Scaffold this active site. Structure first.
Site, short mmCIF file in Angstrom:
data_model
loop_
_atom_site.label_atom_id
_atom_site.label_comp_id
_atom_site.label_asym_id
_atom_site.label_seq_id
_atom_site.Cartn_x
_atom_site.Cartn_y
_atom_site.Cartn_z
N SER A 150 -9.84 -3.90 5.68
CA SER A 150 -10.21 -2.93 4.64
C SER A 150 -11.59 -2.38 4.99
CB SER A 150 -10.08 -3.58 3.25
OG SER A 150 -10.65 -2.79 2.21
N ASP A 313 1.70 -1.92 3.45
CA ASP A 313 0.38 -1.46 2.97
C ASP A 313 0.46 -0.05 2.38
OD1 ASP A 313 -2.35 -1.04 2.61
OD2 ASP A 313 -2.88 -2.03 4.52
N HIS A 343 -1.65 -4.36 1.02
CA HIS A 343 -2.96 -4.39 1.63
C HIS A 343 -3.53 -5.80 1.66
CE1 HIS A 343 -6.40 -2.52 3.36
NE2 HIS A 343 -7.21 -2.85 2.37
N1 HSE Z 1 -12.17 -7.40 -1.13
C1 HSE Z 1 -12.11 -6.05 -1.58
C2 HSE Z 1 -10.95 -5.34 -0.92
C3 HSE Z 1 -9.66 -6.07 -1.21
O1 HSE Z 1 -8.62 -5.55 -0.38
C4 HSE Z 1 -11.81 -6.06 -3.01
O2 HSE Z 1 -11.45 -7.10 -3.55
O3 HSE Z 1 -11.90 -5.00 -3.61
#
Ligand code: HSE
Ligand code: HSE
EC number: 2.3.1.31
Lengths: 367, 367
Positions: A150, A313, A343
């Site tokens: 991400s 995703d 995701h």
């Molecule tokens: N760790 C980040 C991205 C999660 O995919 C969140 O919790 O928003």
């Protein structure tokens, strides 16, 4: 000059003044850091693990003092782990703009008041500059590998592309060369929901006793849905009610109740001001800006990389990883991680992703 | 006993007292109606066209008095069109709960004050009673075909399953047997954003000169994203800026600006209270309730139906249409509409969807 904290303990790394891409200069930057495994004598075995939007430096381990919840990537670093700490030193910062140690809107400026609305917009590239400065202040000038998913994968990408001489390999998980129309769409609107909350007070709510909690919960609920896989959500919750509540008389559905809980979980550990600044940085993500476009920039990057994407995703669709694999010569080919969890799959499919971490670290050792 | 309006003209049909599925009774219900094509002497050629979440009775035609913008399915009904009005009578209501003729929160309650917070929660099944009540008030007791997409497909599935001897064929487009977790997730949160707006005033904002516009705009922006395709959006907007605005100094991206307009467009023609009531009815959608579950209900429905789904649909994915095709014995097989435009595909792929409309009316002839 400064030293890594003890394993598990947090340290705050004074990086000094930082000149952002915007030209502005930020004073007294502080980056929180955590590490697992020993720093080798040459200081050439660092594996930087880069967290995503709401993550922090606590990648692995249990809940404890200073850490209300286990590591966001629990188990990824340790003896025998994918990032095997008997040979590697896993370092994880708290990103610039964050709210868990590092300098962000919630942090205090040199005038004693919280930065607040005065914190400048920063880019993914700024965030990478801050980490490299921090590793510098600790005497680490080359990293063995970067790993991230991400937003963390965006950090990894801008790291390998902007500092190829100072990184040996990269693992880019569920990320793309630039922000997509859909991402910007959901993300700019998430920002709008926070800013529409009356307690937002132009981003200068800190220390007023009011905060934009309603807006932040809205943002997190909508964002959470992007992180999921459609079928898995329907299988878990369907149209079932929450316990014995009746939605036709004002009660909640099970998925609805769950989403509310996800928002409360975020409020108790996260700052709306950082949600805005970091999402803005996500929107501005573009590995090609100022270097001839996505293709030109990637085509020029020689760093060996492993690229992985999740089949289901919905936020960073597989096509985006295929684009990265297509364009980066250091990448042998797309690695498709098969997962039903959307995701969040890259954090869930520990065995399949472990293989990519191993191949990535294998490539750092070839060089 | 009451009059079919002139072709194109709106008419308001008094259906009287209506008893909702909850047992509650709404008095003085009024369903706005429009028709194109001539009603046969047997009164047996009605083709009911059922609009989606924000639609009204104006299915075709150009902008004019009382219709600021052309019909939502401009072109679907006419001489030689898929719904051929030289042979079929295309009737379209404004659903119960709307804000374009029919009784909804914005409508005036008997006390002279708007229904508002006193408007009771209604189901898709209720919406169909009101439509069936209106056609009865006009001397129409049986329809030839029901055609709808999205919310209008739930109105068409509850019509074919609940009034099986008073409809000859159905066209179910981009819809499912029940609400999915993902749908409920995004939709309850959309409601939450409307209700978190300060000017919501518990739903009784109607005569107070202020309204929850920020919240309704947040809801539409998020919803709009579900109706689009990820690729076509990225192809349309990418991460380009809007005109000459600079997002890194407070400007908007092209998709962000586009989404802002989508919300503005809705505000000038739609009621926040109806958005809430109608989304509730979407969440409560479940063709199996009180009939032993989805399979039992569909397996018992013998009505010939056409089922179409869009490959790239992100709100009602193709799997939901496969289920409808699998379970309804009157369905020969899923008809897959190829489209890159996501959910909005059924209004855009006029030849492909029109091809299916002809097939449905073909079945109503046979019967
Ligand atoms: N760790 C980040 C991205 C999660 O995919 C969140 O919790 O928003
Ligand atoms: N755009 C439709 C939903 C189906 O596209 C509406 O809101 O009326």
């Amino acid at each position: 000059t400064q030293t890594l904290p003890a394993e598990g303990e947090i340290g705050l790394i004074d990086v000094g003044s930082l000149q952002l891409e915007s030209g502005a200069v930020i004073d007294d930057v502080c980056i929180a850091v955590q590490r697992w495994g020993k720093l080798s004598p040459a200081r050439d075995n660092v594996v930087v693990v880069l967290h995503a939007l709401t993550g922090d430096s606590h990648i692995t381990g249990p809940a404890g003092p200073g850490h209300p919840t286990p590591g966001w990537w629990d188990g990824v670093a340790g003896p025998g782990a994918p990032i095997d700490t008997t040979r590697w030193c896993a370092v994880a910062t708290n990103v610039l703009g964050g709210c868990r140690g590092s300098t962000g809107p919630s942090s205090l400026a040199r005038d004693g008041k919280p930065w607040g609305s005065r914190f400048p917009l920063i880019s993914i590239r700024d965030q990478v500059q801050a980490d490299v400065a921090a590793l510098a202040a600790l005497g680490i000038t080359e990293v063995a590998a970067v790993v991230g998913g991400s937003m963390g994968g965006a950090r990894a990408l801008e790291w390998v592309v902007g500092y190829p001489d100072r990184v040996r390999a990269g693992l880019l998980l569920a990320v793309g060369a630039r922000a997509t129309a859909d991402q910007i769409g959901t993300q700019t609107t998430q920002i709008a929901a926070i800013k529409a909350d009356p307690d937002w007070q132009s981003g200068d709510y800190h220390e007023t006793g009011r905060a934009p909690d309603a807006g932040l919960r809205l943002a997190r609920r909508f964002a959470h849905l992007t992180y999921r896989g459609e079928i898995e959500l329907d299988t878990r919750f369907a149209n079932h009610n929450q316990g014995n509540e009746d939605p036709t008389a004002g009660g909640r559905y099970a998925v609805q109740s769950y989403l509310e809980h996800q928002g409360d979980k975020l409020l108790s550990r996260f700052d709306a001001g950082s949600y805005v600044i970091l999402t803005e940085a996500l929107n501005s993500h573009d590995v090609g800006r100022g270097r001839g476009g996505v293709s030109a920039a990637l085509r020029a990057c020689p760093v060996p990389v492993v690229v992985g994407g999740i089949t289901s995703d919905r936020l960073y669709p597989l096509r985006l990883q295929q684009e990265l694999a297509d364009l980066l010569p250091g990448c042998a080919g797309l690695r498709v991680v098969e997962s039903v969890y959307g995701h969040d799959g890259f954090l869930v499919e520990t065995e399949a992703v472990g293989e990519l971490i191993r191949q990535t670290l294998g490539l750092a050792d070839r060089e």
